[PDB]
């Protein structure tokens, strides 16, 4: 389906979870270096993640690198400094969805260059605290996948007409 | 908003995450014993969760206890053995949403008593693998909250639960 972009992820557990999520959903996952972990982190390795599976993930040396590399139709970012809820955007086929590190936001130097209508926020009640990154992406990805009718899912009720690709 | 019901949760990190989730969303969270951890486990308590939100959670000694306690108007369960996607049901107020342990499913003795259209599934592509429980709940809770217009969100463009 769409492409998912993690910016300088710090906790390997979260990235593990997101790889699983992208596999089960058929979304392409991109990491933007540098990461707070390396394969030699047992935290990543001992999560039952396959070595080759992890190395398959498209890496980038910088955000610039990523940009020149992918030439994304529309780039999105999850930020508390954005305007629309994740469910309020209309996701279309070329879209890229980016997510900040666990402890710090995506740098303003990036966000500032971005339309306010492509900076998304997950709803929150009064005096909320921040939500786990992998939960954040799961919510976002499953919403995107919804708007795209869950194209590719095998465990849905029987559709009247018949339907491996991103 | 609605009520979230974890059945014998095992991994504390997941429950931590779900408490955060319920706090940020205004859903009541219900645990069914036995938990795979102690109510004061450092993995739960010391997670950066506030003390004024880590409580106000009803715990229950059995499923029956829970049932007599809450008398849920309509009860739902996430299960691979169900038919409709989570996004395909229409959640109404007073619905309860229940979720199995990380490693084992909700027992059949419970599921079998339940209508087919209240046993939900999160979509998956072929040869999918299991998804983190807290991810599962987040997805479901945020979908429910969507159908309910995100009532209670402060950070949108445009009562107690």
Curated annotation (Swiss-Prot), chain B:
GO terms for molecular function: identical protein binding; RNA binding; tRNA (5-carboxymethylaminomethyluridine(34)-2'-O)-methyltransferase activity; tRNA (cytidine(34)-2'-O)-methyltransferase activity. Its EC number is 2.1.1.207. It is found in: Cytoplasm. InterPro entries: Alpha/beta_knot_MTases, SpoU_MeTrfase, TrmL, tRNA_m1G_MTases_N. It comes from the Bacteria. Homodimer. Methylates the ribose at the nucleotide 34 wobble position in the two leucyl isoacceptors tRNA(Leu)(CmAA) and tRNA(Leu)(cmnm5UmAA). Catalyzes the methyl transfer from S-adenosyl-L-methionine to the 2'-OH of the wobble nucleotide. This is tRNA (cytidine(34)-2'-O)-methyltransferase. It comes from Haemophilus influenzae (strain ATCC 51907 / DSM 11121 / KW20 / Rd).
């Amino acid at each position: 389906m769409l492409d998912i972009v993690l910016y300088e992820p710090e906790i390997p557990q979260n990235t593990g979870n997101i790889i699983r999520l992208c596999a089960n959903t058929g979304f392409r996952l991109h990491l933007i270096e540098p990461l707070g972990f390396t394969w030699d982190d047992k935290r990543l390795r001992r999560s039952g993640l396959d070595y080759h599976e992890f190395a398959e993930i498209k890496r980038h040396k910088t955000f610039e690198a990523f940009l020149e590399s992918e030439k994304p139709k529309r780039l999105f970012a999850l930020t508390t400094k954005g305007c629309p809820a994740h469910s309020q955007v209309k996701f279309k086929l070329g879209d890229y969805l980016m997510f900040g590190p666990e402890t710090r936001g995506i740098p303003m130097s990036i966000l500032n260059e971005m339309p306010m209508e492509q900076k998304i926020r997950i709803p929150m009640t009064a005096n909320s605290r921040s939500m786990n990154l992998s939960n954040s992406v799961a919510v976002t990805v499953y919403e995107a996948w919804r708007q795209l009718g869950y194209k590719g899912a095998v465990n849905l009720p029987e559709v009247k007409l018949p339907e491996g690709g991103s």
